Structures are given as C-alpha cells and as structure tokens.
Amino acid sequence: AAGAVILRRFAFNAAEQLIRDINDVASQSPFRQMVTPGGYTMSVAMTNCGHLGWTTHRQGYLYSPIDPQTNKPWPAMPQSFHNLCQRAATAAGYPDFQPDACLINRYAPGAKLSLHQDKDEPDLRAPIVSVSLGLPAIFQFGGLKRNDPLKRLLLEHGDVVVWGGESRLFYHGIQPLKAGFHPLTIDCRYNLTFRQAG
Numbered sequence: 444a445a446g447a448v449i450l451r452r453f454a455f456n457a458a459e460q461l462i463r464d465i466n467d468v469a470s471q472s473p474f475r476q477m478v479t480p481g482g483y484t485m486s487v488a489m490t491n492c493g494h495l496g497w498t499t500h501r502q503g504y505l506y507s508p509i510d511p512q513t514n515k516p517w518p519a520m521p522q523s524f525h526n527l528c529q530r531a532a533t534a535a536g537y538p539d540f541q542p543d544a545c546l547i548n549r550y551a552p553g554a555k556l557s558l559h560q561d562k563d564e565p566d567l568r569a570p571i572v573s574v575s576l577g578l579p580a581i582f583q584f585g586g587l588k589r590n591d592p593l594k595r596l597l598l599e600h601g602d603v604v605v606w607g608g609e610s611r612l613f614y615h616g617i618q619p620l621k622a623g624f625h626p627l628t629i630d631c632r633y634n635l636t637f638r639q640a641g
C-alpha cells in the first residue's frame with residue numbers, strides 16, 4: 444500500500460475510552476443502517492461525530508453538518524478522538540492533518556462493506572485515519588478499478604491505518620465479519636475514519 448502507514452495496536456491504550464465515547468456519540472446520533480441511493484440498506488451500521496458527517500443522499504453520497512435522521516447536528520468530535528487521531532497522523536507523517544469528520548462504522552457478525560472509493564473529500568491530498576476496535580476484520584484494497592488485484596489485510600483491535608498518498612484513491616472494502624467475541628465490544632467491531640471533509 445503505497446503511501447499507507449499501518450500502526451497496529453496503536454490505539455490499544457485509548458481503546459476503552461474511545462468505546463465509551465462512541466456510545467456517547469450514539470446517544471445523540473444513534474447507529475443506523477443507511478439506505479444507499481439505489482434504495483438498499485447497508486449491512487454496516489453507521490453514525491458520525493464532528494462538524495461534518497458522511498451520509499447517503501438521494502443524488503449520491505455526501506457530507507452534511509446535520510444528521511438526516513435526527514435532523515440535529517452530528518455530535519461534536521470527542522477529545523479522545525481528536526487526540527488519538529492527531530497522535531496517529533503525526534506519527535504517520537501528517538502533523539498538520541485536522542479532521543472535521545469521523546465516520547463511525549459498527550459491524551455485527553456477517554456485516555460487510557463491498558468495494559468503494561473515498562472521493563467525496565475536497566482535497567484528496569489529505570489522508571484518512573482508520574481506527575479498528577473490537578473483533579478482527581479482513582480489509583481488502585485494490586487499484587484504481589473495481590476489478591483489480593485485491594490484497595487482504597487483517598485489522599485487529601486497536602489497529603490504526605493512516606491512508607495517504609496513492610492508497611488514498613484505492614478501491615477498498617471489508618469482508619463479512621466472522622463471528623467471535625471481544626471483552627470490550629462483545630460481538631461487534633467498530634471503526635473510526637477521520638477525514639478532512641470541509
């Protein structure tokens with residue numbers, strides 16, 4: 444993964460607090476399985492915190508400062524989130540990265556996320572910070588086409604990946620979450636993706 448920086452277990456120490464704050468965020472903006480523009484309910488449940496929140500719209504996908512479900516602003520990005528992200532980005536070589544959106548994904552057993560690209564951001568030179576929590580998942584990324592040599596990478600609890608450079612444009616997805624158990628998330632996997640959407 445050219446440009447990518449994988450920091451395994453980087454968020455192990457912050458894990459517990461992050462999970463507490465995810466629940467906090469969920470209290471204001473509950474996890475919901477968004478309906479794609481094509482009219483299909485995603486198996487992955489999501490929510491957002493920060494100034495902007497990624498969401499499905501009628502004309503496609505886009506960032507909005509308002510939660511379309513609660514009609515209220517997305518919850519603010521918790522300090523735990525801000526700190527872990529900055530430390531990660533800085534360690535990855537991006538000390539200037541200032542995210543304004545954190546997409547929180549929740550994966551129940553069997554949940555998956557078919558291949559896609561993240562080109563909804565204004566400046567693609569800005570990286571994306573991914574933090575995995577709970578059960579392990581198989582992350583798969585390819586080239587520039589939906590049908591390209593896909594590679595696999597297991598993301599475990601506390602794993603952080605700063606996607607910068609070329610990888611920032613690579614197709615990617617998550618294979619069906621295998622059943623299992625984790626003391627902090629029980630049978631769920633959470634993932635935080637910090638972005639500069641503004």
Ligand SMILES: O=C(O)CCC(=O)C(=O)O
Pocket residue numbers: 546548556561573582598615616617634636
């Ligand atoms: O949970 C994952 O590792 C995938 C998250 C992702 O790429 C996204 O939702 O845009």
Ligand SMILES: [Fe+2]
Pocket residue numbers: 559560561615
């Ligand atoms: Fe993505």
